[PDB]
Amino acid sequence: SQSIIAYTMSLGAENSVAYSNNSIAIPTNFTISVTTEILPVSMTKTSVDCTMYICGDSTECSNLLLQYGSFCTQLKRALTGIAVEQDKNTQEVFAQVKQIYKTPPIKYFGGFNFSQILPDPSKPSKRSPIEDLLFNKVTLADAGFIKQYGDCLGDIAARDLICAQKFNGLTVLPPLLTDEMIAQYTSALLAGTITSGWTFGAGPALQIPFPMQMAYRFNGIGVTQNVLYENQKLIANQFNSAIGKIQDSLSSTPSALGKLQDVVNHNAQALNTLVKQLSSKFGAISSVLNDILSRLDPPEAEVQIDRLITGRLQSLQTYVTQQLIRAAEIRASANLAATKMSECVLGQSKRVDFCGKGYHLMSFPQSAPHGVVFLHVTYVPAQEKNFTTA
Amino acid sequence: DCTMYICGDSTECSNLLLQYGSFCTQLKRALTGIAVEQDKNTQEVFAQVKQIYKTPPIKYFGGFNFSQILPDPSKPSKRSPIEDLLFNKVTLADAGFIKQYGDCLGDIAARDLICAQKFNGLTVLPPLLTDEMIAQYTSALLAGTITSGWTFGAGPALQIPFPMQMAYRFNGIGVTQNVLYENQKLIANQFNSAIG
Amino acid sequence: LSRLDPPEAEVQIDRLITGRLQSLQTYVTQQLIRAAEIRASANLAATKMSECVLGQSKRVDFCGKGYHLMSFPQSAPHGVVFLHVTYVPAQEKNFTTA
Amino acid sequence: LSRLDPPEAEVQIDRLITGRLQSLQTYVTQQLIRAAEIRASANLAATKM
Amino acid sequence: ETKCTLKSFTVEKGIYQTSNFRVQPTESIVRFPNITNLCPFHEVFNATRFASVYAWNRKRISNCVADYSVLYNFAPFFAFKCYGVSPTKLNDLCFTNVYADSFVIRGNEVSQIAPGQTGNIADYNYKLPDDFTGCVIAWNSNKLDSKVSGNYNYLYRLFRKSKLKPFERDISTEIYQAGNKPCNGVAGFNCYFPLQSYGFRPTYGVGHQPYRVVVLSFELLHAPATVCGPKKSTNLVKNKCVNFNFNGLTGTGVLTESNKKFLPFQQFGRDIADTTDAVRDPQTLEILDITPCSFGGVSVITPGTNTSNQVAVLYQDVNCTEVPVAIHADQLTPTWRVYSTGSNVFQTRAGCLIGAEYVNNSYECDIPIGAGICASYQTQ
Amino acid sequence: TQSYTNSFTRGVYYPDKVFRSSVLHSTQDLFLPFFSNVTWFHAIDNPVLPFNDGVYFASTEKSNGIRGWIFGTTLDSKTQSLLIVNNATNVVIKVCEFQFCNDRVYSSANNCTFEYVSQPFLMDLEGKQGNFKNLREFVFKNIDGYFKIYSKHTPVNLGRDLPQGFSALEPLVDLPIGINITRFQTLLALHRAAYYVGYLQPRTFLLKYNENGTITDAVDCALDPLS
Ligand SMILES: *[C@@H]1O[C@H](CO)[C@@H](O[C@@H]2O[C@H](CO)[C@@H](O)[C@H](O)[C@H]2NC(C)=O)[C@H](O)[C@H]1NC(C)=O
Ligand SMILES: *[C@@H]1O[C@H](CO)[C@@H](O[C@@H]2O[C@H](CO)[C@@H](O)[C@H](O)[C@H]2NC(C)=O)[C@H](O)[C@H]1NC(C)=O
Ligand SMILES: *[C@@H]1O[C@H](CO)[C@@H](O[C@@H]2O[C@H](CO)[C@@H](O)[C@H](O)[C@H]2NC(C)=O)[C@H](O)[C@H]1NC(C)=O
Ligand SMILES: *[C@@H]1O[C@H](CO)[C@@H](O)[C@H](O)[C@H]1NC(C)=O
Ligand SMILES: *[C@@H]1O[C@H](CO)[C@@H](O)[C@H](O)[C@H]1NC(C)=O
Ligand SMILES: *[C@@H]1O[C@H](CO)[C@@H](O)[C@H](O)[C@H]1NC(C)=O
Ligand SMILES: *[C@@H]1O[C@H](CO)[C@@H](O)[C@H](O)[C@H]1NC(C)=O
Ligand SMILES: *[C@@H]1O[C@H](CO)[C@@H](O)[C@H](O)[C@H]1NC(C)=O
Ligand SMILES: *[C@@H]1O[C@H](CO)[C@@H](O)[C@H](O)[C@H]1NC(C)=O
Ligand SMILES: *[C@@H]1O[C@H](CO)[C@@H](O)[C@H](O)[C@H]1NC(C)=O
Numbered sequence A: 001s002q003s004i005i006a007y008t009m010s011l012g013a014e015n016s017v018a019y020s021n022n023s024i025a026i027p028t029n030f031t032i033s034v035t036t037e038i039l040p041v042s043m044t045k046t047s048v049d050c051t052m053y054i055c056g057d058s059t060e061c062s063n064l065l066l067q068y069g070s071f072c073t074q075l076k077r078a079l080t081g082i083a084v085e086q087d088k089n090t091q092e093v094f095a096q097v098k099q100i101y102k103t104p105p106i107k108y109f110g111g112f113n114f115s116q117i118l119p120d121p122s123k124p125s126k127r128s129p130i131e132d133l134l135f136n137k138v139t140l141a142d143a144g145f146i147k148q149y150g151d152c153l154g155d156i157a158a159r160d161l162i163c164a165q166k167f168n169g170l171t172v173l174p175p176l177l178t179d180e181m182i183a184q185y186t187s188a189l190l191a192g193t194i195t196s197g198w199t200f201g202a203g204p205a206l207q208i209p210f211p212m213q214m215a216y217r218f219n220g221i222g223v224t225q226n227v228l229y230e231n232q233k234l235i236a237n238q239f240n241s242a243i244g245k246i247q248d249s250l251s252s253t254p255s256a257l258g259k260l261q262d263v264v265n266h267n268a269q270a271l272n273t274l275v276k277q278l279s280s281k282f283g284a285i286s287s288v289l290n291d292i293l294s295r296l297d298p299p300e301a302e303v304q305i306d307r308l309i310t311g312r313l314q315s316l317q318t319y320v321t322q323q324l325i326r327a328a329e330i331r332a333s334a335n336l337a338a339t340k341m342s343e344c345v346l347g348q349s350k351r352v353d354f355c356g357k358g359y360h361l362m363s364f365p366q367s368a369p370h371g372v373v374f375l376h377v378t379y380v381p382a383q384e385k386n387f388t389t390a
Numbered sequence B: 001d002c003t004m005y006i007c008g009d010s011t012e013c014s015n016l017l018l019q020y021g022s023f024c025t026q027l028k029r030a031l032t033g034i035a036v037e038q039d040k041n042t043q044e045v046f047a048q049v050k051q052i053y054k055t056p057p058i059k060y061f062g063g064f065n066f067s068q069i070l071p072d073p074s075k076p077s078k079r080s081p082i083e084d085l086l087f088n089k090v091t092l093a094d095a096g097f098i099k100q101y102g103d104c105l106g107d108i109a110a111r112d113l114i115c116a117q118k119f120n121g122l123t124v125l126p127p128l129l130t131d132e133m134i135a136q137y138t139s140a141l142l143a144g145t146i147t148s149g150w151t152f153g154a155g156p157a158l159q160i161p162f163p164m165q166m167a168y169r170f171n172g173i174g175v176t177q178n179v180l181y182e183n184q185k186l187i188a189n190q191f192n193s194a195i196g
Numbered sequence C: 001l002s003r004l005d006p007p008e009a010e011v012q013i014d015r016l017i018t019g020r021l022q023s024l025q026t027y028v029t030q031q032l033i034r035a036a037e038i039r040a041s042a043n044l045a046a047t048k049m050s051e052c053v054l055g056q057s058k059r060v061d062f063c064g065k066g067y068h069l070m071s072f073p074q075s076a077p078h079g080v081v082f083l084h085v086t087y088v089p090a091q092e093k094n095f096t097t098a
Numbered sequence D: 001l002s003r004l005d006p007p008e009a010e011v012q013i014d015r016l017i018t019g020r021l022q023s024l025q026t027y028v029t030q031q032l033i034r035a036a037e038i039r040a041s042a043n044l045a046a047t048k049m
Numbered sequence E: 001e002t003k004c005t006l007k008s009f010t011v012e013k014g015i016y017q018t019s020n021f022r023v024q025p026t027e028s029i030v031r032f033p034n035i036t037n038l039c040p041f042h043e044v045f046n047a048t049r050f051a052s053v054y055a056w057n058r059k060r061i062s063n064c065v066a067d068y069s070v071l072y073n074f075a076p077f078f079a080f081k082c083y084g085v086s087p088t089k090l091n092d093l094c095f096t097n098v099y100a101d102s103f104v105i106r107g108n109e110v111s112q113i114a115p116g117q118t119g120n121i122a123d124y125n126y127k128l129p130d131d132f133t134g135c136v137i138a139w140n141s142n143k144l145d146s147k148v149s150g151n152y153n154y155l156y157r158l159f160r161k162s163k164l165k166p167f168e169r170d171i172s173t174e175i176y177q178a179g180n181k182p183c184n185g186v187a188g189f190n191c192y193f194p195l196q197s198y199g200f201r202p203t204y205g206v207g208h209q210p211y212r213v214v215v216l217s218f219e220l221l222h223a224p225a226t227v228c229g230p231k232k233s234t235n236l237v238k239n240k241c242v243n244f245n246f247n248g249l250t251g252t253g254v255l256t257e258s259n260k261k262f263l264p265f266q267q268f269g270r271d272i273a274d275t276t277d278a279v280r281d282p283q284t285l286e287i288l289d290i291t292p293c294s295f296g297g298v299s300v301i302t303p304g305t306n307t308s309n310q311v312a313v314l315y316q317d318v319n320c321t322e323v324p325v326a327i328h329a330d331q332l333t334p335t336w337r338v339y340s341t342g343s344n345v346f347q348t349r350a351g352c353l354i355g356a357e358y359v360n361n362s363y364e365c366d367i368p369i370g371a372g373i374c375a376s377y378q379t380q
Numbered sequence F: 001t002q003s004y005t006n007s008f009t010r011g012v013y014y015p016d017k018v019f020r021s022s023v024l025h026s027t028q029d030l031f032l033p034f035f036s037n038v039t040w041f042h043a044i045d046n047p048v049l050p051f052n053d054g055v056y057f058a059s060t061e062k063s064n065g066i067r068g069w070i071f072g073t074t075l076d077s078k079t080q081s082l083l084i085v086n087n088a089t090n091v092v093i094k095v096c097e098f099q100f101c102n103d104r105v106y107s108s109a110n111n112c113t114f115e116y117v118s119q120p121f122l123m124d125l126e127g128k129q130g131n132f133k134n135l136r137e138f139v140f141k142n143i144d145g146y147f148k149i150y151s152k153h154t155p156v157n158l159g160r161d162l163p164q165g166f167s168a169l170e171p172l173v174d175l176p177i178g179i180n181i182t183r184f185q186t187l188l189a190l191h192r193a194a195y196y197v198g199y200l201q202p203r204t205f206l207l208k209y210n211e212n213g214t215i216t217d218a219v220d221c222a223l224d225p226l227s
C-alpha cells in the first residue's frame, strides 16, 4: 500500500481576477498576524597550533619545519582576524541603545499581554519564556568557556571528539559577550519600545500611552485612528491569540531553527575532518613520526618527514581558506540583521515585504544561540465586497 | 569525478590515490553545496506569489497596450515577444538536459570540447526549474499587477480599474490625480511609444 | 647550479619552484577575498550617495542619527566621507492627554 | 607504467597525482568565490522584485 | 618574548598570543620481554651444502636475543642491502619472527633478488613480494663452489607453465610440454627436462662465478614480540610524565592503570587518530593508558610600551587554582616563573589571570579578555 | 546428498589485532558475502571440493565426526600437500609429499621436512545434556604463503537450517606452508544437518565496534544500493 512515485511539481493554486471597467473590491474587516524570522549573527572562534598539529613533540620535525619560512604566522593571523570579526559582529546588532531601560512595576498596557516576551524574574537567568525554547532547541558542541582540561585523562571510556581535538592543538575560544548580558540588551531594547514608541531611537525617550502609539501606527499605513479606538478590545484579543500560538508552533515542530544549527554542524564537521586527516601516509613509509624515526637513519628519514610536513601544511591551508569564505558569508548575514533591527524595531518600515508580510506595524527582538529572532506584527486585510466606482 | 580525472582507468594509480585521505570527499561536498545554492537562488526571486493569476479574455486597459509583455498564445512556449529577443541573444554552451552521450563516438570530425570534458569526468547538471515554468511565474506576477495594483502582495487580491490605479500612482509622487484624467489619452501614447 | 651537475640540480630547482608557486597562489587567493569585501563596501557607499545626498531619506539610522535633513560628500584617499545634518529634539515637558 | 618497473614508477605517479590534486583544488576555490558573488547579486534581485 | 614574536622594539596596547607552555619529562624507562637465549646465525652463514635456488632452504628464528653485528665476521660480504629498515637501526627493534632463506646463484642474477623484478630467477625460481621488509646478503664464493672439471651439483628451473607467487616453492620433476605432441616422459623433440644444470669453473670471469645468497625477512607488525635486540629493561613508573620505550614503541607521556578489556590476541590500542592509546606491559601483561603531557596557551596583556613595562599573563583555559604548573630547574618550557604575586591571581571563565587585581566596580571595556571580563591600566 | 541454503549475516572475523572502541572502521579484505548460497552436504563419498580465495566451513556435530582436512594439488605423490589431522589432545599439522590412503591417512613420505604440534582446535561442552549442539565455524585462507585459520564455537544454537544473528571469529595460527593449493577434502570417521561449505570473495565491509571492543554489526558495500 506504500510505494515511491514520481511526478511533475506544481507551481501553486489557480486563481482568476474579475477585472472590469467600473468595479472595485473593498475589505470590511482585518486581521493581526505575527510571523517570525531567524538570522545568524556569528560563528565559533577557533585557534590552531602548527607545532603541535604537524610535528607532535618532536625536535627533528620542528627543525625541518623552520625551513619553510612563515607559513604559520599567516594562518595564525587569518584565524585571529576571523575571531575579532566574530566578536565585532554581535556588537553592531545588539548594542543599538546607549542606556538601559526598565519596565514599570505595574504592567497594564490597555489589554495587550506581553507576558511571553518580557523577562521572567523567577528564572535565574532572567530570560523570556520564548527565549528558553530557543535556547533548548539548539545544542552547541563546545561553548568554549568550560576549562575542560582535567577530565580527558579520566574519561575511562572512549574519549570524546573534544579531547581528541584538544590533544592535537585545535581549541575553541569563548565569546566576549556572555549570553547573559545579551539578554540584558534585548530587554533594554524591548522595554523602551512599549513605553516610548520610536522616539528613543532618535533623541531622548518620550513616554506615551500604548493605545495612542497604536493609533499612530495605524495612521502610518493609511487607516484613520478612529478605527482602532472603536475596535480596541477586539484588536487586543487578536494580538493575544497571535502570540499564544507562536510558542506552540516552535515547541512541537521538529526543527524550526534550522538556520542556527547548520553553522554548528559545519564547524564541528570541519574540525573532525581536520583531526581525521592526521592518519594519512601521503606516500611515505608510515603515518607516525616516531615510527619512521626509529626505523631509518637520519639522512633518509628527512625525505619521509618532508612528505608528512608538505601534506599536513596543505591539509591545514584548505581549512583556513574555507573558514575565511564562511566568515565573509556570516558577516553579510549579520549586516542584514543590523539593518533589520535599526529599521523594523526602532521605527516603522514602509518597504514592501521587508519587515514581514502585510502592512508592517511592529517588531520585537529575541536572542537565540548565535543568532537573532524577529517577531513581526503586521496588518492583513479581510472580508471584501464588490462595489461600483466612478 | 576524481577517479576518472586523475587516474584514468588505472588500478595502481587508484591504490596510490587512496593514500591521500579524504581530499576528494571535500571537493564533492563543496560542489554539491554550490549546486544546491544555485537551485535555491531562482526560487527566492520568482516564487513570490502563492497563486497563479490569469488575464481576462478581453484586453482593454484604458488605452495602454501591454501586447509586448503579455504571453503569446500562438508561440508554443507561451513567451512574450520581448522575452524571445532575450532568449535568442544569449547562447548557452551546455544546457545540461540533453543526454548527449551516444554521439561523441560518431562525431567523425574533430570532437567538440563537450565530449573532451565528458570523457574526463567533468559533467554539467540541469536546473530543477525548467525555463518553461519560470515564464509561468513571470506571467502570474505580471497578470496580477495590472488587474489588482499592489494589493495582491499584502493580502487577498482586490480588483481595480487601471486608470484609477494610475491616478493612485501619480498621487503617490506628489501630483494630484486630476492631472492624469485630464491628460489620460496623451499619457497612454507616451507609454505605447516608450515600449515600442 | 654552480655546485651540482645538471642531472641532480633539477631536484633542488624543482623544490624551489614548487615552494614559490604555492607562496604566490596564497597571495592571489587572499587578494581575491579582500577585493570581494571592498566591492561590497563600495556598493554600500554608492547606495548611500544616491539616497542621502540626492534626496531625503526616511529610513531610520541610515543617513546618520536623528531625523535626516541633508548630507554632504567629501573625498579622502581611497574612500569617501559623508557629513550628515540631522535634527534632534530637545527640552521636553510633561502633559496630560486624552 | 610500461617503461619502468613498479618500484620506481611510484615516484612518477606520485608527481602526477600531486600535480592534478592542486590543479583541481584551484578550480573548486575559484568556483566558491564566484558562487558567493552570484548569491549577493541574486539577493539584490529578490529585494528589487 | 612579545617583542620577539612580532619583530619590533615597541609594542602597542592590546593582548597578544605569544606561545604555548608544556611540561617536560623527568625520566626514561625501557621495557622489553624476558628472554636470554642467543639464537644461532652461525648455523646459516657457516655451512658447507648451500641449497639449490629452485629448492631454497628456509629457517625460522624464535625466542632469542638477536645481535645483527656479530654476523659481519661470518662472511666476506661488503654490505647488507636493506629495504624496509635501515641496517644501522637494527639493534633497537623487536620483531615477531625472522625467516632466513639460503641458496646460491650466478653473479649477474644477484640483481634479480629485489621487489618487482623479472627474469629466469624471479619468475620460476624465487619471487619476493612488492612490499618486502628485510635485508639481503650476497657474497662471492668462487673458492668453494667451483671445480676444474665443473660443479654439476646445483640446478635451476628453466621451463614452467606460469610465474610463481611470492615466497612459493615448486619442487617437482615433470616433463615440460612445449609443442603439440603430448609426450609421456620421452623428453624428446619439443619436450625438455625443466631443470638445467648450472656448471661452474674457476676460469669464468666475474658475473659468471657462483654467488652465495641469504635473505632475512622480518615481521614489523603489531603482535607479541619474540626476537629482540640486546637492551636492558628498567623499572616502571606511573602517574608521572616520562619517556617510554615499550617494546620498540617510543614516546612520551603519563602512564596510568587501565579498565580496558584487551583480548588475549590483542596487544595495542588506538583511538581515531591512528595513534596508540593503550599498551600491554611485556613482562606484566597489564593494560596501561597513555596521556599527553600538560600543555596550554599563554597570552600577554600589556599597555603601550611607551606607558609602562608592566604586563599581565593569561593562561588559557586552565584550572590554575589546581594546576599552577609551578616548576623548579628544568621542568617547563616558558622559563620566567611570573608566579608568586600575592593576592593578584584571578580565575576567569576563559582561563586564569596573573598580575592583575580584580576590582568590583564597572567601567567601559578597554582591553577585551573574554567572558565579559576586561582589563585596563588605571591609577591607584 | 546435498542442497543449497542461505547464509544470512554470518562469517565476520577480526581484521587485525588492534583494540578499538566506539568506532565505525571500514576494511577491505576477503569476506563471505551476505545472503549467499552455502552448500549443505550429507554423510552416510566425500567429494574433493575446489579451494579458491579461502573457504568458510561450518559444522553442527554432537560430539565429534570431523578429524581434519587435506590440501594440495592432485592430492598424490608428486606435489606437496598439507595435513591438519586432529587428535584427542593434539594437532599434527604438517607439510609433506604424502602418497595416498584411499580410506593413518597416508602411506609414505617422500620429501617432507615440515611439522607442527599445538592444542586441539575442537572444544566442546555440555550442560549435562546433548541438546547444546555447539556450532563450529572456521575460515581458511592462503594469502602469500602464511596459511591463516580463524575459528569460533557458538554453543547457544539449537539448529534447524542456519543461525540468524551476528558473531565474530578469532585467529588461531599463522604458519608458512609456501605451497600451491587448489583442491580441498575432509576427513571423517564412521558412527554406530551439518557440514556447510562456502567460499570467500574480496569485498569491503564497514564494521561497528562496541563500547567493550567487540564487533556488534557490519554492513556490506556491494550488496544493495542502500548498503
Ligand atoms: C471581523 O473578524 C472578527 C474575527 O473573525 C469577528 O469577531 C468575531 O465575531 C463573532 C461574531 O460576533 C464571534 O463569534 C467571534 O468570537 C469573534 N472573534 C473574536 C476573535 O473575537 C468580527 O465580528 C468581524 N467583523 C465583522 C464586521 O464581521
Ligand atoms: C497574560 O498571558 C499569560 C500567559 O498566557 C496568562 O497567564 C496564564 O493564565 C492562564 C489562565 O489563568 C493560566 O492557566 C496559565 O497557567 C497562566 N500562565 C502563566 C505563565 O502565568 C495571564 O493570565 C495573561 N494575563 C495577564 C498577565 O493579565
Ligand atoms: C498594440 O500593439 C501591437 C504591437 O505594436 C499592435 O499590433 C501591431 O499593429 C500594427 C498596426 O496595425 C501592425 O502593423 C503590426 O503588424 C501589429 N503587430 C502585431 C504583433 O500584432 C496593436 O495594433 C496595438 N493595439 C491593440 C492590440 O489594440
Ligand atoms: C470596457 O469599456 C471598453 C470600451 O468601451 C469596452 O470595449 C469593454 O468591452 C468594456 N468592458 C466590459 C467588460 O464590457
Ligand atoms: C576547576 O577547579 C574548580 C575548583 O576546585 C572545580 O570546582 C572544577 O571542577 C575544576 N574544573 C575542572 C575541569 O577540573
Ligand atoms: C465580484 O463580482 C465578480 C463577478 O460577478 C465575482 O466573481 C466576485 O466573486 C465578486 N466578489 C465577491 C467578493 O463576491
Ligand atoms: C535517446 O533515445 C531517443 C529514443 O530512441 C532518441 O530519439 C534520441 O535521439 C536518443 N538520444 C541520443 C543522444 O542518442
Ligand atoms: C514627568 O513626570 C514624571 C513623574 O512625575 C517625572 O519623573 C518626570 O521627570 C517628568 N518629566 C519632566 C520632563 O520633568
Ligand atoms: C665455519 O667455521 C669454522 C670454524 O670457525 C671454519 O673452520 C670453517 O672454515 C667455516 N666454514 C666456512 C664455509 O667458512
Ligand atoms: C597452482 O596450480 C594451478 C593448476 O596447475 C595453476 O593454474 C596455478 O597457476 C598454480 N599456482 C601458482 C602460483 O603457480
Ligand SMILES: *[C@@H]1O[C@H](CO)[C@@H](O)[C@H](O)[C@H]1NC(C)=O
Binding pocket: E034, E283, E284
Ligand atoms: C624473568 O625470567 C627470570 C628467569 O626465569 C625470572 O627469574 C624472573 O622472575 C622473570 N621476570 C619477570 C618479570 O617475568
Ligand SMILES: *[C@@H]1O[C@H](CO)[C@@H](O)[C@H](O)[C@H]1NC(C)=O
Binding pocket: E359, E360
Ligand atoms: C567588592 O567586591 C567583592 C567581590 O565579590 C564583594 O564581595 C564585595 O561585597 C564588594 N564590596 C563593595 C563595597 O563593592
Ligand SMILES: *[C@@H]1O[C@H](CO)[C@@H](O)[C@H](O)[C@H]1NC(C)=O
Binding pocket: F004, F035, F036, F037
Ligand atoms: C542459490 O541457488 C539457487 C539455485 O539452486 C538459486 O535459485 C538461488 O537464487 C541462489 N541463492 C541466491 C541468494 O542467489
Ligand SMILES: *[C@@H]1O[C@H](CO)[C@@H](O)[C@H](O)[C@H]1NC(C)=O
Binding pocket: F086, F087, F088, F089, F090, F091, F092
Ligand atoms: C594424540 O595425543 C596423544 C597424547 O597427547 C599421543 O600419545 C598420540 O600419539 C597422539 N596421536 C596423534 C595421531 O597425534
Ligand SMILES: *[C@@H]1O[C@H](CO)[C@@H](O)[C@H](O)[C@H]1NC(C)=O
Binding pocket: E055, E171, F110, F111
Ligand atoms: C626426495 O627423496 C628421494 C628419495 O631419496 C630422492 O631421490 C629425491 O631426490 C628427493 N627429492 C627432493 C626434491 O628432495
Ligand SMILES: *[C@@H]1O[C@H](CO)[C@@H](O)[C@H](O)[C@H]1NC(C)=O
Binding pocket: F210, F211, F212
Ligand atoms: C561491557 O561489559 C560490562 C561488564 O563490566 C557490561 O556491564 C556492559 O553491558 C558491556 N557493554 C555492553 C555494550 O554490553
